[PDB]
Amino acid sequence: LKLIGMLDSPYVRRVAISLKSLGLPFEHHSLSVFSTFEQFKAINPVVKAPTLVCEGGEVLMDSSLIIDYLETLAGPQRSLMPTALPQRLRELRLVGLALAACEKSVQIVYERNLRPAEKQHGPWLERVGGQLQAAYGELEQELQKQPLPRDGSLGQAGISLAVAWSFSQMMVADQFNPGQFPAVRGFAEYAEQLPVFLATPAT
Amino acid sequence: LKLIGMLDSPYVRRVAISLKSLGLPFEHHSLSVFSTFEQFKAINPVVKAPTLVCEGGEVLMDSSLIIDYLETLAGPQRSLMPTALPQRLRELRLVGLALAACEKSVQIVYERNLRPAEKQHGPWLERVGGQLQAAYGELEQELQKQPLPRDGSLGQAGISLAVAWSFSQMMVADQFNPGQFPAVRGFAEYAEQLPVFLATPA
Ligand SMILES: N[C@@H](CCC(=O)N[C@@H](CS)C(=O)NCC(=O)O)C(=O)O
Numbered sequence A: 001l002k003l004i005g006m007l008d009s010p011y012v013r014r015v016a017i018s019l020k021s022l023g024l025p026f027e028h029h030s031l032s033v034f035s036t037f038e039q040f041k042a043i044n045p046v047v048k049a050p051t052l053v054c055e056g057g058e059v060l061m062d063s064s065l066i067i068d069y070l071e072t073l074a075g076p077q078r079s080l081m082p083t084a085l086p087q088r089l090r091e092l093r094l095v096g097l098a099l100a101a102c103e104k105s106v107q108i109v110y111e112r113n114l115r116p117a118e119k120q121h122g123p124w125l126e127r128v129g130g131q132l133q134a135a136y137g138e139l140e141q142e143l144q145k146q147p148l149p150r151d152g153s154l155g156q157a158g159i160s161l162a163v164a165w166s167f168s169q170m171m172v173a174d175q176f177n178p179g180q181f182p183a184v185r186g187f188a189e190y191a192e193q194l195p196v197f198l199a200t201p202a203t
Numbered sequence B: 001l002k003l004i005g006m007l008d009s010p011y012v013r014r015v016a017i018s019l020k021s022l023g024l025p026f027e028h029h030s031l032s033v034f035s036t037f038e039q040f041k042a043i044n045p046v047v048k049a050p051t052l053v054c055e056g057g058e059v060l061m062d063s064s065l066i067i068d069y070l071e072t073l074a075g076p077q078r079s080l081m082p083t084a085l086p087q088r089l090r091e092l093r094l095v096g097l098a099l100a101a102c103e104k105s106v107q108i109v110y111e112r113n114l115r116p117a118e119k120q121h122g123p124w125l126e127r128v129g130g131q132l133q134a135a136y137g138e139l140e141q142e143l144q145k146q147p148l149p150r151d152g153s154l155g156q157a158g159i160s161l162a163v164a165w166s167f168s169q170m171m172v173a174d175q176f177n178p179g180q181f182p183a184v185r186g187f188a189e190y191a192e193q194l195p196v197f198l199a200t201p202a
Helices: A010-022 A037-043 A063-074 A085-113 A122-145 A156-171 A182-191 B010-022 B037-043 B063-074 B085-113 B122-145 B156-171 B182-191
Strands: A002-004 A027-029 A051-053 A059-061 B002-004 B027-029 B051-053 B059-061
Touching: A002 A010, A010 A063, A010 A085, A010 A156, A037 A051, A051 A063, A059 A063, A059 B085, A063 B063, A063 B085, A085 A122, A085 A156, A085 B059, A085 B063, A122 A156, A122 A182, A156 A182, B002 B010, B010 B063, B010 B085, B010 B156, B037 B051, B051 B063, B059 B063, B085 B122, B085 B156, B122 B156, B122 B182, B156 B182
Parallel strands: A002 A027, B002 B027
Antiparallel strands: A002 A051, A051 A059, B002 B051, B051 B059
């Protein structure tokens, strides 16, 4: 198995940590969809990261679909997802919120770095920034109501939430202030000291 | 169950058709993340469509996660996904390509409508347009290799691919030449005449 993409992308990182958490060995090819376009295009012409090349050479994209494939390959015993409806529903909500925070953080990065200042649109940044704040706000309320376990093991919500938070702090820190979203920050900083996160640095 | 969003969004439409295909009843609330921002924000502060409000009131977002939840409620017998690894791998590859097509199509729409002319960036549109072509090119090769069944039934790949194609032709047709991707076009046009697609207009 081969994971194509840079770990500074939260989508690539959540897959990398999911792979390790599921016990599936793999090769990591650190390629950028922007600075090594041709090299990435040679593997996946759609040029989307993460891209997973399976044992037979099949190419997959989209972090959630890649993880669905990995979950299938690993078997139910290793699932990072609860199966009971209530519990799974909650997990899906947390992952959804975390992925929304990822999407909005990335949209801000793209708006500011992929086009000249003159073409940057204030109303767009305002909207996206508000959505980013809402996402972490919802996550904060969920965690304040029901804290995540800190037992050395991780579920998809924990992985995705930690990866998302650390990414936002690295790339769009100007959207945050010290002490903000204490529950989310607290869990992310706890997760970042777990062996699997330490072995998969974003940078 | 309540589905919040407009069917012109391929992400919302894929969920709507998945719901019907899984046999799960639901209420459809046709709300726009743009023209009815506040109303949508009151239901989901993040303002992302589709949003699914569960029986208990829980709010879920992201079409793939929503469908995962729905697959769970519906049970294995109703699954729109193959379980055997080789077949599930292919299905996931097809869905991934379809969603990539949706993403790039939406990005072109956003670039051309959420900012005035002088804010539009040509290099970005050219990049995204190229990725859109690549997504359907890959899908076309997959279909030529193994055609999709036309027995009135649908899998997630079929639903997502058809919704993606129809969306692209409706919103960014200027990116396509008529003879391109005949197998993809062919399947989408077949699917659109199926009862579930006719009962769920975009
Ligand atoms: N739904 C995808 C989103 C991945 C994504 O937007 N990746 C970025 C890197 S952070 C990218 O490939 N940008 C290249 C492009 O869209 O041109 C996932 O969860 O993998």
